[PDB]
Design a protein around this ligand. Structure first.
Ligand SMILES: Nc1ncnc2c1ncn2[C@@H]1O[C@H](CSCC[C@H](N)C(=O)O)[C@@H](O)[C@H]1O
Ligand SMILES: Nc1ncnc2c1ncn2[C@@H]1O[C@H](CSCC[C@H](N)C(=O)O)[C@@H](O)[C@H]1O
Ligand SMILES: [Zn+2]
Ligand SMILES: [Zn+2]
Ligand SMILES: [Zn+2]
Ligand SMILES: [Zn+2]
Ligand SMILES: [Zn+2]
Ligand SMILES: [Zn+2]
Lengths: 428, 428
């Protein structure tokens, strides 16, 4: 209303569009909007951090792309595009008579996919994926000191790595360490779900020493299980994401379990004066709260690094990584073994309409024998870069096993992160 | 009817689809259909040669893609695709109830653009661009001897080239020779249209010696204007194409003018025993008659080479080249100066809906300021690889000047053809 008056004053060439916050009309313009033209206030930045990568059950976005709010959104008909524009923003930026006429247009593209990209009051920024990548380096609100860089140990003095993995799951971390060829002295792993225990037990041949709940692990246990060289972990994102219809709380349950990772990290950290190389990785999803992200950043005493798996795999798996692993910032490289198209990850006799599937109405992504079908479990394993038939251990249902796969880290992303640890520990 | 009974016998698994000609149902199966599954009789090959690259004023194909005939065609809604499938072929290859239901589907893709690409009675063969390229090397019906290869003259003995150009137009051939840096001793050029004379006169600075009509050039004129080292030419394709609505004849007018090229070629050819390097190029369009193409091949005593300009420029300019220039067969290489996208050839402030434009309701190809607009004349010059503002010589209308541009050869294609002549003649 006020913001509509503001945009009116802009289009009469009395105000610039870059001096106003196009999302909510605030005069407190600190940032520029990354995708489109206009300013950006800090409250809208927080709403943009929370809401931008939130998708409905539909597969399309939970909220409007422009303001991250809105009332009734307009979904994009273009293939593989999931954006939504609410009616109130299109009333401004395209005009008050063009939203209604654009609904009537049955093949309707959105304004990030428009074959032009230059409209009257709304024009798209020259480099938006670059500004989306820079927008998370723009999160300097939480300013910290850089992680301490330890000088590399000589190759003759290297020893097998010792990993304390919390929230192990299906043993993605040890699998990636074996893929890199790093000698593993021992791999302690706390985990509760029996199926994920079992996957790890069979795929890693009894090498993993299994613990009960993370809440049963004392500091005495951490001291007596040998010094650890690498502590890894990732909080549950079943409740923390907006994909679950049952969002009774946000940091009930999952939040607790983060602090369990925090405590055992401090229990495994060497003392000051003990300059031995120690490393740690935490992982969380991007569709999360701001104050949540702040508290996590403050407790772990570091700046998160967003890493999307689209750069290396066939999925849209954008995840925050906290840590001190060297080269956590450096850009991702996709090897020729990694399959950047979805079609390569399909079985034979199946052809994909999508090029990237995202799993946290075309719910089922595969057109085989003139019929819609979901990705088979072994293909979902291929999508994340697991070895072929990785989860076929025990007599478990398909729904459970898909659910067991979807929680897991993306394997070439974790390979990219763990790769400079070869410089610090022994090889096979 | 008979072919519909035949396909009925094929769906019972009593006959292979590859043993029948899917176009017209003939049992005389010599070839396989290049795009889809099925045989191909020779009459259908001739109909395929004539009709496949024929486009209506719409921009879309003149006839069906499958059988090159049909009754009522179904046009494809996908962007940049111009194929049409007639109702009678879709009755077979997809089914007698699916054509009617596929009309009702408003975003309808065709079966060369189908996301799945695998239908019940119609499937798409995999290496179809390779088989489309091989299909014109499959024209061995006109078998001839290969063009005589002359050994290269040493670099100190090279002399400036002497070109007899017939049907010069806007002096594309001399411009391409100057682009290559070859010294030109003289450039005789017959041409009748004043505007094209004038373009050549101004852009090539009075170097061109202009003649009247080609029918006024005697063998005495050919002898007295010096020995020629390179004779080039191209028949008019205004009447010869199906794009002109006034197709009263096919080889009235244009056919004559071909024979004028034929005669003056023989008049410019050195005698047997005179082993001096002599070369010649003829050009014609691909949407032409078969017996036309035969007669041309027989008179010029060679096999045509189809060359599409899409490989090097932003247009679809598929043209037959007869000649003896070395490396006329070898595959086209597009330099970094050549613009393979249409958008790069646009002016600033204009954004293209297409990536390629071919011009022999999206009739106007450019979305600028919420409005549909023709390519400007200087952009059409950029599309074919002419220098910028090439035709802005005299006070001529826009319709005439566009018409003057559209007839012309594609400049990087002619650069690709003329390039090995540097090995035979002097450089600047
Ligand atoms: N208290 C607890 N202790 C250990 N594991 C727990 C736990 N509560 C939940 N989990 C498990 O921890 C996982 C959360 S996320 C798992 C991702 C893991 N990196 C992987 O690649 O598999 C789930 O498998 C969940 O069942
Ligand atoms: N009898 C004739 N003598 C010479 N030129 C003729 C002619 N009849 C037609 N022409 C011209 O020859 C051209 C046919 S095609 C021209 C293409 C030429 N290579 C170019 O790049 O411009 C047209 O410009 C036409 O006007
Ligand atoms: Zn705001
Ligand atoms: Zn909005
Ligand atoms: Zn879109
Ligand atoms: Zn036939
Ligand atoms: Zn047909
Ligand atoms: Zn199509």
């Amino acid at each position: 209303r006020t913001r509509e008056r503001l945009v009116y004053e802009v289009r009469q060439k009395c105000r610039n569009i870059e001096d106003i916050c196009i999302s909510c009309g605030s005069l407190n313009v600190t940032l520029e909007h990354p995708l489109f033209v206009g300013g950006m206030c800090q409250n809208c930045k927080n709403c943009f951090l929370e809401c931008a990568y939130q998708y409905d059950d539909d597969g399309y976005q939970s909220y409007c792309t422009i303001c991250c709010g809105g009332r009734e959104v307009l979904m994009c008909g273009n293939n593989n595009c999931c954006r939504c524009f609410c009616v109130e923003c299109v009333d401004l930026l395209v005009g008050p008579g063009a939203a209604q006429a654009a609904i009537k247009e049955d093949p309707w593209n959105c304004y990030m996919c428009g074959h032009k990209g230059t409209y009257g009051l709304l024009r798209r920024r020259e480099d938006w994926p670059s500004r989306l990548q820079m927008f998370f380096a723009n999160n300097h609100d939480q300013e910290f000191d850089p992680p301490k860089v330890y000088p590399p140990v000589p190759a003759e003095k290297r020893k097998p790595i010792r990993v304390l993995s919390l929230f192990d799951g299906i043993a993605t971390g040890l699998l990636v360490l074996k893929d890199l060829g790093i000698q593993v002295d021992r791999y302690i792993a706390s985990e509760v779900c029996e199926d994920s225990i079992t996957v790890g037990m069979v795929r890693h041949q009894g090498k993993i020493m299994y613990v009960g709940d993370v809440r049963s692990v004392t500091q005495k246990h951490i001291q007596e299980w040998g010094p650890f060289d690498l502590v890894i972990g990732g909080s549950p994102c079943n409740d923390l994401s907006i994909v679950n219809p049952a969002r009774k709380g946000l940091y009930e349950g999952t939040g607790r379990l983060f602090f369990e990772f925090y405590r055992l990290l401090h229990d495994a950290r060497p003392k000051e004066g003990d300059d031995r190389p120690f490393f740690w990785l935490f992982e969380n999803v991007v569709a999360m709260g701001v104050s949540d992200k702040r508290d996590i950043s403050r407790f772990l005493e570091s700046n998160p690094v967003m890493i999307d798996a689209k750069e290396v795999s066939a999925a849209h798996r954008a995840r925050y990584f906290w840590g001190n692993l060297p080269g956590m910032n450096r850009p991702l490289a996709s090897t020729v073994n990694d399959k950047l198209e979805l079609q390569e990850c399909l079985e034979h006799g199946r052809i994909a309409k999508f090029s990237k599937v995202r799993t946290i109405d075309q719910h089922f992504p595969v057109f085989m024998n003139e019929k819609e079908d979901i990705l088979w479990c072994t293909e979902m394993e291929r999508v994340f870069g697991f070895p072929v038939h990785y989860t076929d251990v025990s007599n478990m249902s398909r729904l459970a096993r898909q659910r067991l796969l979807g929680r897991s880290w993306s394997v070439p992303v974790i390979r990219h992160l763990f790769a400079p640890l070869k410089e610090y520990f022994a090889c096979v």
